[PDB]
């Protein structure tokens, strides 16, 4: 299982946002939980794919339109994984990255982004500088349809 342009394993833009569809798509020893939230003047459903006590993925959609991956065992097919150092991927934040954690588009991808976390430095309403960020690490991989 990897994050790719098409989704996460067999979870894709055509995957219904439904318990049995997701469970059939999933390839691992996961549990599944659900929830609802507010979006665009309505209420939408989401699923949390659970790996033990911890969220491995959040699936949003009523068909899947976003998957946040927190499971360190699922890399991006760009080779990026949870824990990848910022400085492995980017020489600077400018234009690549924005406050989500900081979120950056994967180079050459239309669908994949990485969120980074690390020690915050400076004012809270801006992206931290390049010298702080160099030591940040990937804390989430995000796919969007």
Curated annotation (Swiss-Prot):
<keyword id="KW-0732">Signal</keyword>
<protein>
    <recommendedName>
        <fullName>Uncharacterized protein YfeY</fullName>
    </recommendedName>
</protein>
């Amino acid at each position: 299982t990897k994050v790719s342009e098409q989704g996460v394993g067999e979870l894709t833009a055509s995957t219904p946002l439904q318990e049995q569809a997701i469970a059939d798509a999933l390839d691992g020893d996961y549990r599944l939980r659900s929830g609802m939230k507010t979006a665009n003047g309505n209420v939408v459903r989401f699923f949390e794919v659970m790996k033990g006590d911890n969220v491995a993925m959040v699936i949003n959609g009523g068909t899947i339109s976003r998957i946040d991956v927190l499971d360190s065992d699922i890399p991006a097919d760009t080779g990026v994984k949870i824990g990848t150092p910022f400085s492995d991927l980017y020489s600077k934040a400018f234009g690549n990255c924005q406050k989500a954690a900081v979120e950056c588009k994967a180079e050459g991808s239309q669908h994949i982004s990485y969120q980074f976390s690390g020690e915050w430095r400076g004012p809270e309403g801006l992206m931290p500088s390049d010298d702080t960020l160099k030591n940040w690490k990937v804390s989430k991989i995000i796919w969007r349809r």
